[PDB]
Amino acid sequence: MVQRWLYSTNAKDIAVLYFMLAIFSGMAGTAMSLIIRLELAAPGSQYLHGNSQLFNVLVVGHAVLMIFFLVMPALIGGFGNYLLPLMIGATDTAFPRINNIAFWVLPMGLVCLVTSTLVESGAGTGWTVYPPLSSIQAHSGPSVDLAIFALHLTSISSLLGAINFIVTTLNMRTNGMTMHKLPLFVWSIFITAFLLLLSLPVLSAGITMLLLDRNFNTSFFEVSGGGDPILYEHLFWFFGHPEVYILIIPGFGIISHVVSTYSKKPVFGEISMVYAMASIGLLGFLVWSHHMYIVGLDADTRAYFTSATMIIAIPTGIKIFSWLATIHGGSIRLATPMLYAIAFLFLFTMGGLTGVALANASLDVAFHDTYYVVGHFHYVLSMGAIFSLFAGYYYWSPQILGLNYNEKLAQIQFWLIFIGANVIFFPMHFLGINGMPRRIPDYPDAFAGWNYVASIGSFIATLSLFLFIYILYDQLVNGLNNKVNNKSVIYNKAPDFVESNTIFNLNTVKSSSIEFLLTSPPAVHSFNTPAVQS
Amino acid sequence: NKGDSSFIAKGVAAGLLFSVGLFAVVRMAGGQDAKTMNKEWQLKSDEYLKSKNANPWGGYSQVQSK
Amino acid sequence: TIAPITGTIKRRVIMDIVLGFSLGGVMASYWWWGFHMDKINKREKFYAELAERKK
Amino acid sequence: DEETFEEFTARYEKEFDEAYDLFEVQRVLNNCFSYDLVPAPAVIEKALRAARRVNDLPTAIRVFEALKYKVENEDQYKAYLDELKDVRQELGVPLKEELFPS
Amino acid sequence: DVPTPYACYFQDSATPNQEGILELHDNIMFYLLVILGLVSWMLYTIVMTYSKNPIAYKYIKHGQTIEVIWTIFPAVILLIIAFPSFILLYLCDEVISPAMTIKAIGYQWYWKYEYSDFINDSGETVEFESYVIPDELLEEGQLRLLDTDTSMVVPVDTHIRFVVTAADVIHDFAIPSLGIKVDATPGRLNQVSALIQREGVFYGACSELCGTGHANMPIKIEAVSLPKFLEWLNEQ
Amino acid sequence: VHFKDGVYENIPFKVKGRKTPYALSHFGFFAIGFAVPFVACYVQLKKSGAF
Amino acid sequence: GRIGESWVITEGRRLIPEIFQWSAVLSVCLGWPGAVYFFSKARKA
Ligand code: HEA
Ligand code: HEA
Ligand SMILES: CCCCCCCCCCCCCCCC(=O)OC[C@H](COP(=O)([O-])OCC[N+](C)(C)C)OC(=O)CCCCCCCCCCCCCCC
Ligand SMILES: CCCCCCCCCCCCCCCC(=O)OC[C@H](COP(=O)(O)OCCN)OC(=O)CCCCCCCCCCCCCCC
Ligand SMILES: CCCCCCCCCCCCCCCC(=O)OC[C@H](COP(=O)(O)OCCN)OC(=O)CCCCCCCCCCCCCCC
Ligand SMILES: CCCCCCCCCCCCCCCC(=O)OC[C@H](COP(=O)(O)OCCN)OC(=O)CCCCCCCCCCCCCCC
Ligand SMILES: CCCCCCCCCCCCCCCC(=O)OC[C@H](COP(=O)(O)OCCN)OC(=O)CCCCCCCCCCCCCCC
Ligand SMILES: CCCCCCCCCCCCCCCC(=O)OC[C@H](COP(=O)(O)OCCN)OC(=O)CCCCCCCCCCCCCCC
Ligand code: CUA
Ligand SMILES: [Ca+2]
Ligand SMILES: [Cu+2]
Ligand SMILES: [Mg+2]
Predict the structure, then answer these.
(1) What are the boundaries of the signal sequence (chain G)?
(2) Are E214 and E187 spatial neighbours (Cβ–Cβ below 8 Å)?
(3) Is the dihedral of CA B8, B13, B18, B20 positive or negative?
(4) Distance (Å, whole) CA E184 – CA E104
(5) Which candidate, A333, A263, D71, D11, places its Cα nearest to that of E57?
(6) Distance (Å) from the alpha carbon of A409 to chain B's nearest alpha carbon
(7) Apex A182 CA angle, A181 and A187, nearest 5
């Protein structure tokens, strides 16, 4: 018991620890966004007693927890470590001891970020940590150091895990499976592992150089020694954009499996889906300065970055039309995973179309630090990547756990988050176009209207999260009963039209990936004689 | 099963009611209103803006309170 | 004898795509000629009367 | 896949004669109704005579039920029931509306 | 000039640069509405008809005609709006034949203005600092978090060059109704141009997180006539 | 190393055959997560002299 | 020839009801903030 969970070398057990830590962290990051939305409900001091430093501290904590401690350890640390070895026939990962250190650095990085908010005054800097606001003159004491060490520990985690993902895919495939025969979810973790390998080392240069200015009398970014603050932004954003794609592509591969299963059709143009995922991962290294359109760059620099940013809309739109082509002419089964996937196609398109407006440098003059930007990236990260994370859990957890969930309770949960997420973020575009800046705890009185509407939706969506916590409890205590009563779905594919009920019992599963052919909780020794395909 | 969609619509409408009524209870522990959020103060704001010719084709009125 | 029946689903994807462009093309037509052209003509009336006050 | 309609009938006629149990007759029937066309009357006749040879009446009832889903009008359903008149009568196959009348 | 409650559009424009920014926003939204009309319609009429389809079309897996066509169509749309977007980019970057230059410097939670053309009758530098009026000191009718104790006065119909920098950390000079937004970085000077076509008061704010006082550092600009500006200049 | 197989065997926590109800573990674990932002606020508002 | 009614009449009978159901859904998803402003103090006094 001690050595199964502290000494582990099994990739399935480690993936369970990842998901446990990932979900404990989304609690804290949701609680911070609730405190933030209560202080923005009306003009004046509301709940924080006029402490503007504390409001800024909670905004940094909110972004770091959601990105580096929820979405990455769950989509990649969780689903990647559990389903990638099973989908290719591997008996383990390569490097099983590397696989274990890449988890145990995240608990130590949390007891570095939490103690950062409790020491002196915390880090009220934004998640980008620009200098000179984050140097020792404008932020004294050890708070910004402890936040940098936390970011260092998440980079060790993601880099070590990426090296392991790349070797396993290239070296440990089963008999007959060639690189053209991989499932689309395996392709999405493989391409993501390469973006992490080529972007993380540039971020570790930028924030280690920021640590040197603060404590070792160095002038990379200090203006009195010749340094330049605009250098830090080039180094930070050269990792940033690749990161947003490191957060959506694993969700692109989940959406492919769910949509194909509940249509009873194979993915339309499956080979052009891999080519599109590779083109988006390559064009995500050539567009980073759309995040610096107003800092004073040249006009010919800005005209290049406009056209480079726009052309990533072509490969992404191929994936959107491809997904609509597989459900056309299908036999659609509206279980809970299918509901999230259909909402993803509608809410991701909206968030991506507000990005096309932002891509032009001329128009971004009216769209800088404007709530309009906040509206763009919560449509693609919270109705995007988050919706694909719910779709995954409802798709694979009955197999992984051996326990079913209450179906009609889960459709109530879906509608409560779909309604509540739209109420928070749709009026954010109205505030931004009229000119409301971001990162403020207080505003002029003409912005009170839409700010009240968004704070109401924030309560609707937190209630939907508390219903999900109860659904987990019901699945773990009543999961075996959910199979014998009629409170859950047993088969994600139903018999075909002319297929009789008893013929269907000969082959219950019609799957194009291995994972649905294992025992319900898969065995700890899953393959002895290797699997074989033609 | 038959009768499940109606349970779903009733559960969604009961979840909307509970969250909205909980918001109004937490609001009652919030801080006092700002001194400028009145109709009397907002009508002298419009006096100043009408002189300076504010927003000459889309409106300048600040009145949103009681 | 019964003549063959083919291409039912092929020809109903042509009408879906034609309908989608027509529907999205009337929402966009109102935005330009109804909403945007409305604000342009108000603005151009404020200025064209401002020049007359300069005589 | 460039298969003409004439090649479609001549290939599934051959495929219904080789089916040797219920699994085979139901699997071949499933693939025949999954294209973008309604099988010809001469294909439906061979699918009825294949379910007789494995001794299964519900599979022969479902043949005409799929036929009424795949046609475009209700006058295309009628013209099939008027071509396959003897065979439905000679083997004793009822229609699903005739069996569960409403 | 001022934000309004429940507004869902641009504040009214006072310069040709903000006139052009709005024209490009509306031109782009014409095509984003065609695309959203298609995608939402195909999504709706696929769920409503194939959730009741008992036999799936499992042998449709590719198409050469539609896949080429839907790769070219987004490229034509993207090219249509890049033409006016490039023209606006180079029309706003030019600063040719201005008649006056003003410097604006950002500080830890106030602004600072300097006139150094030496046009006034005594030929000095005119300079003052601008602070937000605190809540405890407001007079009834003044606007919270917007009105300042001093403002910047400019004339109308005059081309103006703005020079922006900073003293301690990064700030941002921004006024929504003038089409102005530019970072203020310690160490370098950026420039922007303007030409105001009507009189009035235009409000802005700092737009680069600068610490606890990031919300208490507004910008207020008054545009007056030429004889009226010379009288104000020659006194203060 | 050889481990066991089954339903409740691939998780680190005990759900059945325990003395204390599993509800105290399940909701206590997610309560502590939801409660760390409020502990931070308390320390910092007690430093500014607001309390 | 062709048996039955024209494919235009058959397809017309299926799509016309769906056009109206589409426009009544997209109006709710995009026009629901218009109702909040309808019952506000700021509106029309
Ligand atoms: C992962 C990304 C992510 C997510 C999910 C969210 C979710 C939310 N965010 Fe935030 N947000 C950011 C990333 C994210 N945000 C970033 C980067 C910033 C900018 C920081 C900066 O300005 O410096 C930001 C800034 C930001 C601000 C700006 C504050 C200011 O400028 O100072 C506001 C304001 O309201 C806000 C609100 C919200 C709200 C209300 C939600 C809520 O609506 C959430 C709704 C849904 C949920 C409740 C989450 C689901 C719950 C889970 C635990 C999932 C579990 C699932 C399974 C395991 C299957 N966010
Ligand atoms: C999941 C995360 C995610 C994703 C996927 C994206 C995707 C895109 N983003 Fe975004 N972005 C963020 C997360 C993300 N972004 C965050 C967190 C910030 C703020 C950071 C911060 O400041 O803290 C940000 C900010 C940001 C900026 C900086 C703006 C500013 O700060 O002032 C820009 C600039 O251009 C941008 C544009 C785009 C574009 C063009 C895409 C494109 O990939 C979108 C393409 C998708 C589509 C276009 C939809 C479907 C397409 C079709 C159906 C084809 C047909 C279409 C046409 C013909 C037009 N976003
Ligand atoms: C079909 C289309 C969709 C259908 C549409 C469905 C959704 C429709 C939404 C419309 C409802 C929106 C109401 C908004 C909430 C509200 O207005 O609250 C009113 C006030 C608080 O509002 P406030 O103005 O922000 O308070 C000011 C803060 N001070 C100054 C007090 C410190 O509250 C008060 O102080 C007085 C009220 C006190 C609370 C009692 C009210 C009932 C709550 C009972 C609690 C039940 C649940 C709690 C269980 C613990
Ligand atoms: C703050 C200062 C910076 C410190 C850097 C972080 C320190 C964390 C790691 C501490 C070193 C302990 C040894 C573990 C490594 C190991 O043992 O590699 C040995 C592994 C063992 O394979 P196996 O046992 O898994 O399989 C069992 C098979 N017998 O061979 C491999 O994988 C092959 C590939 C080697 C790649 C090693 C990469 C080096 C790790 C450090 C990477 C840090 C990147 C960030 C750089 C700043
Ligand atoms: C969308 C605008 C409003 C959204 C916000 C309010 C939502 C309504 C509140 C919850 C409704 C509960 C209804 C009960 C369930 C039900 O309806 O079930 C009825 C049917 C089938 O069940 P049955 O009747 O056959 O059997 C009943 C046996 N007891 O399921 C459905 O069709 C589900 C529809 C799936 C939709 C997918 C997700 C939709 C979001 C995507 C965006 C849509 C595109 C937008 C562009 C057009
Ligand atoms: C997903 C992101 C979407 C981006 C949307 C951002 C906003 C873009 C600009 C939209 C202009 C709205 C018209 C203003 C009407 C007005 O005049 O408003 C009037 C009132 C208050 O007005 P008032 O009293 O203050 O003064 C003026 C008094 N006449 O408000 C409202 O009725 C709110 C109604 C909301 C409007 C619906 C918006 C529909 C646009 C859909 C966009 C689709 C996105 C395309 C793909 C990305
Ligand atoms: C506090 C109780 C003490 C009681 C005193 C003992 C007296 C005898 C009582 C018997 C109980 C023994 C107590 C032992 C501790 C215990 O069983 O539950 C206590 C455990 C804690 O311990 P932990 O091992 O999980 O480590 C963690 C310690 N930080 O809570 C929990 O994690 C609850 C967690 C549940 C939430 C996880 C939900 C995830 C589901 C898995 C889905 C995975 C999907 C994967 C997809 C990739
Ligand atoms: C896709 C998802 C769609 C979901 C639909 C949204 C419904 C969920 C609940 C939304 C919360 C409402 C916020 C109210 C905040 C408030 O307090 O409003 C205050 C305003 C008055 O203003 P005041 O200045 O006096 O405030 C004073 C502050 N103390 O009173 C109202 O207007 C009542 C609310 C109106 C009801 C409309 C609800 C939307 C339903 C849309 C139906 C379809 C419309 C189609 C139009 C074409
Ligand atoms: Cu100066 Cu924010
Ligand atoms: Ca406030
Ligand atoms: Cu970006
Ligand atoms: Mg900025």
Answers:
(1) none
(2) no
(3) positive
(4) 9
(5) A263
(6) 8
(7) 140
Burial group, residue D42, by CB count within 10 angstroms (0-12, 13-18, 19+): middle
Active site includes A97?
A: no
The CATH class of the E100-235 domain is: mainly beta
CATH code for the part of the protein at E16-92: 1.10.287.90
Domain of residue C8 covers: 1-55
- Boundaries of every domain in chain E: 16-92, 100-235
A93 catalytic? Reply is no
Q: At what angle do helices A448-478 and A386-401 cross, to 10 degrees?
A: 10
Burial class of E65 by CB neighbour count within 10 A (0 to 12, 13 to 18, 19+): exposed
Class of domain A1-517: mainly alpha
Instruction: Give the Cα separation of A302 and A433 in Å (integer).
Output: 22
Closest listed residue to residue A441, CA positions, set A117, A57, A130: A57
By what method was this entry solved?
cryo-EM
| Beta strand segments in chain E, E | 100-107, 110-115, 126-130, 152-155, 159-166, 171-175, 180-184, 190-195, 200-204, 219-224
Distances (CA, A) of G44 to B64, D23, G31, G38, G40: 10, 72, 19, 9, 9
Distance (Å, whole) CA E108 – CA E169: 8
| Closest by Cα among E3, F44, E215, E207 to A441 | E215
Q: How many domains does chain F divide into?
A: 1
Amino acid at G25: V
- The sign of the torsion formed by the CA atoms of F9, F10, F13, F15 equals negative
Ligand in nearest proximity to the CA of A42: 10
In short, whether A320's Cβ falls inside 6 Å of ligand 2 is yes
- After which residue numbers is chain D interrupted with C–N beyond 2.5 angstroms? none
| Cα-to-centroid distance, E165 and ligand 11 (Å) | 26
| N residues, chain A | 534
My answer on whether omega of the bond before A315 falls inside 30° of 0, hence cis, is no
- Reading the block at residue G25, the tokens are 């859904």
Resolution of the model in angstroms: 2.4
Buried-state track E187-214, b at ≥16 Cβ within 10 A, e below 16: ebebebbbbbebbbbbbbbbbbbbbbeb
